Swiss-Prot record, chain A:
E3 ubiquitin-protein ligase which accepts ubiquitin from an E2 ubiquitin-conjugating enzyme in the form of a thioester and transfers it to its substrates. Several substrates have been identified including the BMAL1, ARC, LAMTOR1, RAD23A and RAD23B, MCM7 (which is involved in DNA replication), annexin A1, the PML tumor suppressor, and the cell cycle regulator CDKN1B. Additionally, may function as a cellular quality control ubiquitin ligase by helping the degradation of the cytoplasmic misfolded proteins. Finally, UBE3A also promotes its own degradation in vivo. (Microbial infection) Catalyzes the high-risk human papilloma virus E6-mediated ubiquitination of p53/TP53, contributing to the neoplastic progression of cells infected by these viruses. It is linked to Angelman syndrome: A neurodevelopmental disorder characterized by severe motor and intellectual retardation, ataxia, frequent jerky limb movements and flapping of the arms and hands, hypotonia, seizures, absence of speech, frequent smiling and episodes of paroxysmal laughter, open-mouthed expression revealing the tongue. It is found in: Cytoplasm; Nucleus. A cysteine residue is required for ubiquitin-thioester formation. The active form is probably a homotrimer. Binds UBQLN1 and UBQLN2. Interacts with the 26S proteasome. Interacts with BPY2. Interacts with HIF1AN, MAPK6 and NEURL4; interaction with MAPK6 may be mediated by NEURL4. Interacts with the proteasomal subunit PSMD4. Interacts with ESR1 and WBP2. Interacts with BMAL1. Interacts with ARC. Residues 12-108 form the HECT domain. The chain holds residues 765 to 872 of 875 of the full protein. It comes from Homo sapiens. The gene is UBE3A. It comes from the Eukaryota. This is Ubiquitin-protein ligase E3A. The active site is at C79.
UniProtKB/Swiss-Prot annotation, chain C:
This is Ubiquitin. It is found in: Cytoplasm; Nucleus. The record marks R54, R72 as: Interacts with activating enzyme. There is a cross-link at K6, K11, K27, K29, K33, K48, K63 (Glycyl lysine isopeptide (Lys-Gly) (interchain with G-Cter in ubiquitin)). Transmembrane segments: none annotated. Changing S65G: Phosphomimetic mutant that can recruit PRKN to mitochondria. Phosphorylated at Ser-65 by PINK1 during mitophagy. Phosphorylated ubiquitin specifically binds and activates parkin (PRKN), triggering mitophagy. Phosphorylation does not affect E1-mediated E2 charging of ubiquitin but affects discharging of E2 enzymes to form polyubiquitin chains. It also affects deubiquitination by deubiquitinase enzymes such as USP30. Exists either covalently attached to another protein, or free (unanchored). When covalently bound, it is conjugated to target proteins via an isopeptide bond either as a monomer (monoubiquitin), a polymer linked via different Lys residues of the ubiquitin (polyubiquitin chains) or a linear polymer linked via the initiator Met of the ubiquitin (linear polyubiquitin chains). The gene is RPS27A. It comes from the Eukaryota. The lineage of its organism: Eukaryota, Metazoa, Chordata, Craniata, Vertebrata. The chain holds residues 1 to 73 of 156 of the full protein.
Length: 108, 76, 73
């Protein structure tokens, strides 16, 4: 699981850029995940924990701005590896909501 | 009365409710305790999804009945 | 286009498919290269079990996408 290949090929949508404070807070949270938190995040956003042939960079993950600050949880579409992330007010709020999402969600 | 809402983490959310409480009120209490909006919640009791507009009594949910919370998030 | 199919054993089968191919066709092709009958195959993409009557485009399977093969019995 190379989450650095995943970050290198990640696109951003809805106003997010690689410079967005939220996106940098995001990658700080994701790179610091435990191996199980990493497998959960991948299960949540791509539908599987096992990396593809070619590596995590093949996912071409998209992180799309899901509107302004809210307590609404992040959502995903696994047929596109799209993660809808609302612009959260903090980083610990982003970590808390994101972790609750990938731990409590199962199904489509 | 007390009811329990089990998450996939195994965590149990204990709610103080009345039998005349609607399913909307139960989602509101879960929202107050967890932050999850009601439209991102799906509540399961006895294999049935709980529908708004009905009371816990209509589902014969009793004291210390256990419901299951699954979150509608990863619709892919 | 080219796609990959990784098994539980870790082996990866490389297939050349067209996006309009149905999942019956992919299972038949897996049978052709590895001998596994299509009724012993279970193909997953994006966490979803893939239906035989569907095409690869219906599941947004693109070039160099990788599916997962679980053996179905």
């Amino acid at each position: 699981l190379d989450f650095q290949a995943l970050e290198e090929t990640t696109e951003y949508d809805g106003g997010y850029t690689r410079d967005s404070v939220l996106i940098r807070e995001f990658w700080e949270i994701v790179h610091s995940f435990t191996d199980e938190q990493k497998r959960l995040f991948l299960q949540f956003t791509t539908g599987t924990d096992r990396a593809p042939v070619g590596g995590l960079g093949k996912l071409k993950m998209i992180i799309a701005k899901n509107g302004p600050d809210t307590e609404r949880l992040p959502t995903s579409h696994t047929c596109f590896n799209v993660l809808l992330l609302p612009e959260y007010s903090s980083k610990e709020k982003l970590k808390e909501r994101l972790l609750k999402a990938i731990t409590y969600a199962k199904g489509f | 009365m007390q009811i329990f809402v089990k998450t996939l983490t195994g965590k149990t959310i204990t709610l103080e409710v009345e039998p005349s409480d609607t399913i909307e009120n139960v989602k509101a209490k879960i929202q107050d305790k967890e932050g999850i909006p009601p439209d991102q919640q799906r509540l399961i009791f006895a294999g049935k999804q709980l529908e708004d507009g009905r009371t816990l009594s209509d589902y014969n949910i009793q004291k210390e009945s256990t419901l299951h919370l699954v979150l509608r998030l990863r619709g892919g």
